[PDB]
Amino acid sequence: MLTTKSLVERFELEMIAGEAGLNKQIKNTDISRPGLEMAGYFSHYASDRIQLLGTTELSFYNLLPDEERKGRMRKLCRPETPAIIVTRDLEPPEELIEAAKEHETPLITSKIATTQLMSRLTTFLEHELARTTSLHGVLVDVYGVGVLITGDSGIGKSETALELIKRGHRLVADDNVEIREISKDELIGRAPKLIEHLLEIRGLGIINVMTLFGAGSILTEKRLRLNIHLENEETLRILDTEITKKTIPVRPGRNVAVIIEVAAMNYRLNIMGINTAEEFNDRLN
Amino acid sequence: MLTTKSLVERFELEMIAGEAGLNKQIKNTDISRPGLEMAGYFSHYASDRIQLLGTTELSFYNLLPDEERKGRMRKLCRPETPAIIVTRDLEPPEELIEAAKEHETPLITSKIATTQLMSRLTTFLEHELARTTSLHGVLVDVYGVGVLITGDSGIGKSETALELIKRGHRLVADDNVEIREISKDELIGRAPKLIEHLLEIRGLGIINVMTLFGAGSILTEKRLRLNIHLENEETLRILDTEITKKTIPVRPGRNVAVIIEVAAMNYRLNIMGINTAEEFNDRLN
Amino acid sequence: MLTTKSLVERFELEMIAGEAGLNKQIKNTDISRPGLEMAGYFSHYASDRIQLLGTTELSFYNLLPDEERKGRMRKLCRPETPAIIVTRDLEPPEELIEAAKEHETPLITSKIATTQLMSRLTTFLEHELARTTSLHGVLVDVYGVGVLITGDSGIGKSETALELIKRGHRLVADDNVEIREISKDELIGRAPKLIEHLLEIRGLGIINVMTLFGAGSILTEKRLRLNIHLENEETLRILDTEITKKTIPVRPGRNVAVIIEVAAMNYRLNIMGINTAEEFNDRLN
């Protein structure tokens, strides 16, 4: 499971005490700012979240009489609390360091503004606790657009991806695609480490695009944005997010790769708010 | 209908008199030089044509005695006569200006040589009185050759045109093509103003080539020269003119766009008088 | 048949005597260095081969007493012997010149080292006595790889070759290919002089690639290395040599020309000792 040790490693956080508590789990992405706790109000809710002590919390705490503040830092270090981070380069109170050691609660110092750090921490947490799955298809980057090509076996997915590569686009994954929903509506795809840089074509066998075309033809990971479904305003649902989908009929008399290129171009255009299907719908009136 | 007003507007002709006659119709493209009329010989034939008075006509007229010339300019201004143009920057006779006002015959002065003006006027007239029709297919400019792509629905006409556009060629019209036979064997095609710059592709929908590819990918009008008929020394007759036609079978294992490009190249070559089908026919002997 | 006259012409060899013997046949590619003959030992074996007299032979011959050497040069000039070449710019013995004239044995002087000349002569001989045949298919040079495209009629061989030409590759022969096995595992292909530079495409007819695309699109001859068999570690046997073969299925949804390009690239890679099918076979373990 995800533990504070992973957090400290990703951001190279400065540990001050509570090293024995680095094996504590971080169950959610939510973050807590225990201001009310500084005033003596404690509760179970949010106790298992990372706690951030910034100017708001410490400016109040430091105005407390010693007899009133007594035990509040200790009560903050509950067993389930994965970490307490003193932000804005503030000095952690001696009582807190003491409590962190006694209760083995990871205590960290950060020089970052509280709000900014909170955003960075939660983003990492969402990335780590990302729902994951795998999909059959080919992931390619076309004009900066992550395109997932799907369709029945033999339809020409890998052959079309090869032509796209030949045309200057990048391969991310062939056959199987590992997908991670690292945040709301953000799907990141990558090839299994085993078939990285590989593309298999009936008749030719397995080829290495990196070896054949160089570094400019590959990309380790890419956010999915467009599903091109090859077949003999729709969408494709993957996990909890839906991405634009275009179903292109395959028949002689056309270059599927070109269609995909234009679909990616049209997509970026639509993203800018420009939609030709509407432009004409109005021109008709 | 076509009236003298349209003529004066197109060439910004200098009107001297007969403004009330600008609503007179110009029925044909033929032009008249009334020399015999200067000698007193009048007839119905050609009276409804634009009349040009150049050096030949006026040098004779100006040698006439006043009593003999009397009424000849008036008899020139017949009701059906749409316009009288004094060319070569010559001075229109007072009698002519007078007659033009009395009979409301548009009187124009031009500084151009009679023969040259005649050619320019008739060319405009043929353009205006051009026979017109519409055709299903896609018109593209490939290596300067106006190519009309035809073939059954779904064969891949628009998809192939899109690939040609992607390859640097220009789109003139998708789906419907307005054709004008502006002169003998000269067919000009253009897209209906409604679908200008548009191309529709099954699966993607309607796209704007101008927005997607820029100005270098479009062309307002183009003379048709080659018909590429996609199918699962021939010609295609359109109105009163026949254009070269090549029937290309569509099947996997080939890039139709490339075939079209070569067909256009071969066409220009044939135009230069070079024909490979003959070159080999001789090499065989 | 192959005669000494052809040999002298190809290398512009310096004839010293025996012109009347230039019509003698050169039956094999083997070459003889008659050292033992200098010592008086003669035999039928190798007598019908070109004979080379270098330092080894002449340094021994010149040490012989006149009575012992008598007749040895004459016995060297057997009727079937097509030619005797004195290499290393050595002086042919008077007795040899005399014998060559008497027996009409072509006598040549060469300034080249014996071993080097032997290699050059035999190479020419193998080229000349090359087994020959003709094959249906299209020969193109793709990234320096001689690719023979085969497959049933209508599959798209010539159309695919045309696309390859359009993509910068070179045409060697369309329809029929003249093959010459000029040495072990070395097959050279060329188009019949009659259809040189020509390519025929259904619908367009016969075109001249040289006229249409210029000199950079043609190649007179090319060694075959890869067979791409279009179909709706294998090899293709031609004469006595086998060349790598890849069978590519043709179906919509793919650009066959691109597949061929990658196959040629993969081939050069495999030649360098790099095989991706193995790279992955190991990565799986």
Q: Going from the N-terminus, what domains does chain A have, and what CATH number goes with each?
A: 1-128 (3.40.1390.20), 130-275 (3.40.50.300)
Judge whether C184 counts as a catalytic residue: no
Token pair of A12 as six digits: 């190279």
Query: Which residues in chain B have Cβ-Cβ distances shorter than 8 Å to A246?
Result: 203-204
Token pair of C185 as six digits: 């595992």
**Under 8 Å between Cβ of C207 and B266:** yes
**DSSP 8-class letter at B252:** T
- The CA distance from A255 to the nearest CA of chain B, in Å, is 7
Q: Give the experimental resolution in Å.
A: 2.0
Q: Which chains touch C (3 or more CB pairs under 8 A)?
A: A, B
Cα–Cα distance for residue pair C50/C25, rounded to 1 Å: 10
Q: Any bridge partners for residue B245, and if so which?
A: B227, B234
B241: Cβ–Cβ under 8 A, 6 or more apart, which residues?
B181, B184, B185, B186, B187
Which residue in chain B is spatially nearest to C160 when comparing CA positions?
A: B254
Record: contact A203-C247, CB cut-off 8 A: yes
Taking alpha carbons only, the member of A63, A104, A102 closest to residue A81 is A104
- Euclidean distance between the first and final Cα of chain C, in Å? 59
Record: contact A166-C262, CB cut-off 8 A: yes
Cα–Cα distance for residue pair A267/A262, rounded to 1 Å: 8
The b-or-e profile of B138-151 (16+ CB within 10 A means b, else e) is bbbbbeebbbbbbb
- Tell me the binding residues of B for ATP: 151-158
User: To 10 degrees, what angle do helices A114-128 and A4-11 make?
Assistant: 120
Residue spans of beta strands (DSSP E) within B101-233:
107-109, 131-136, 138-142, 145-151, 170-173, 176-183, 186-190, 198-201, 205-208, 221-223, 226-231
Identify the H or E element spanning A171: strand A170-173
At residue A81, what is the residue type?
T
**DSSP 8-class letter at C173:** E
Cα–Cα distance for residue pair B255/C257, rounded to 1 Å: 9
Which residue in chain C is spatially nearest to B255 when comparing CA positions?
A: C163
Token pair of A115 as six digits: 């709000």
Query: Which residues in chain B have Cβ-Cβ distances shorter than 8 Å to C198?
Result: 276, 280
The dihedral through the CA atoms of A130, A131, A135, A137 has a sign that is: negative
Cα–Cα distance for residue pair C167/A5, rounded to 1 Å: 56
**Under 8 Å between Cβ of A150 and A174:** no
Which of B247, B254, B263 is facing C156, going by the closest CB pair?
B254
At residue C32, what is the residue type?
S
**Under 8 Å between Cβ of C110 and C55:** no
Number of residue pairs across A and B with CB atoms under 8 Å?
70
The dihedral through the CA atoms of A57, A62, A64, A68 has a sign that is: positive
Query: Which residues in chain A have Cβ-Cβ distances shorter than 8 Å to C266?
Result: 204, 207, 212
Cα–Cα distance for residue pair A108/A86, rounded to 1 Å: 6
The counts of H helices and E strands in chain C are 11, 17
Record: contact A266-B207, CB cut-off 8 A: yes
Record: contact A274-B211, CB cut-off 8 A: yes
Report the greatest alpha carbon distance in chain B. Answer: 85
Cα–Cα distance for residue pair C189/C173, rounded to 1 Å: 8
After which residue numbers is chain C interrupted with C–N beyond 2.5 angstroms? 232
Which residue in chain C is spatially nearest to B229 when comparing CA positions?
A: C203
Report the greatest alpha carbon distance in chain C. Answer: 85
Which of A163, A198, A251 is facing C258, going by the closest CB pair?
A163
Taking alpha carbons only, the member of A13, A54, A19, A16 closest to residue A34 is A54
**Under 8 Å between Cβ of B180 and B130:** yes
- Please return the burial class of B84, using the count of CB atoms within 10 Å of its CB with bins 0-12, 13-18 and 19+: buried
**Under 8 Å between Cβ of A160 and A260:** yes
| Coil, strand or helix at A133 | strand
Q: Any bridge partners for residue A3, and if so which?
A: A25
